[PDB]
Amino acid sequence: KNRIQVSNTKKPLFFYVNLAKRYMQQYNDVELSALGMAIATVVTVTEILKNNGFAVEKKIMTSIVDIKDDARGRPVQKAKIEITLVKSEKFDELMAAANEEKE
Amino acid sequence: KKNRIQVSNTKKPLFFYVNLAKRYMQQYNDVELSALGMAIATVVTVTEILKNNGFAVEKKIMTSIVDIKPVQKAKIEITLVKSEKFDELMAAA
Amino acid sequence: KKNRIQVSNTKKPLFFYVNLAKRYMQQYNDVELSALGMAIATVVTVTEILKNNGFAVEKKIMTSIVDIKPVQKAKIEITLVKSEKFDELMAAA
Amino acid sequence: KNRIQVSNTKKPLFFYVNLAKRYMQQYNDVELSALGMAIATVVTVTEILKNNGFAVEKKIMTSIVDIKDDARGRPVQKAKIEITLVKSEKFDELMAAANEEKE
Ligand SMILES: [K+]
Ligand SMILES: [K+]
Ligand SMILES: [K+]
Ligand SMILES: [K+]
């Protein structure tokens, strides 16, 4: 329910940042994952959410996985990152303040 | 289309695209590489590799902002041709 | 030089470059962003953000291969200008 | 002695791949590290060395670190990756075969 897999090169960065914010709001945590070239996206989303006070990381796992590859004839190996973020203590205030709604 | 490589698969290893570019140059002489957004880095790297290792010469490198059904994304389009060393490098491989 | 941002520092957060571009546009109207190789992805992303969020319009996007004292690297050069909404977005911030 | 930090945007990818090969040849292992945008480089070097039979990973650590930042006035947070690779059992044969020197 709260998992985001980054793989669509058509999506703007803020699609993923905003989805991560929505999932943290709904579920308290969010899991981001990506392979290969998409790892830079997950890293950047995480940096943004940390530097701007929205999130605290709970788990960052990075590993090499086998990917089935028909044309190759045997699996290819790719790096995969998996990041779990939880809501920070400032998340609600910051989401409020975005729209000048802090009390 | 036949000699165009669109880079959009995060499951592929880099060398998939490097080798595909070399195979396309063997048949068509020239090769078009295109990508959006986060995939531009791969196209750039493919190009650098083919240039630095003596396989290719660039003919055209176009970067622009495009609308996707709308959101805006950067798109790169690179056209490469065989270098004077290409055939000998391929034979040596 | 004064209104050019070279992206080459891996220690910087993305929003360093996004905010610097916005500050430069406030003073100069327009801003040049440049990078090599692995940094091109950052320039692309900065640009997409400034376009998608209504701050900027692109005027020029140049990608080329350059010699570095030699090895060849891709280099992007983007020029942005303020959009019609820029001043109001900055005031609202 | 065997550490490679990826941070120079002037370097071609194969500078890092070839340095990693040299360090594995000399020391049996190599440590690759990078922050932020440079993580994609380390990931790609690792994929290359794995898919092509040169290396086996031993450790991949990915974390958020504080970076001193004068202009900011307090530290910024960046993702950092640290990858330790060791020579594979095929490394020597492959380095030989590169130059048609296998026996
Ligand atoms: K309120
Ligand atoms: K094709
Ligand atoms: K400047
Ligand atoms: K021999």
Swiss-Prot record, chains A, D:
Listed A to Z, the keywords are: Acetylation
Q: Which organism is it from?
A: Arabidopsis thaliana (Mouse-ear cress)
SUBUNIT field: Homotetramer.
Q: What is the superkingdom listed in this entry's lineage? A: Eukaryota
Pull one GO CC term from this UniProt entry. nucleus
One function term, GO molecular function aspect? mRNA binding
Record GO biological process: rRNA processing
Write down what this protein is called. Answer: Uncharacterized protein At2g34160
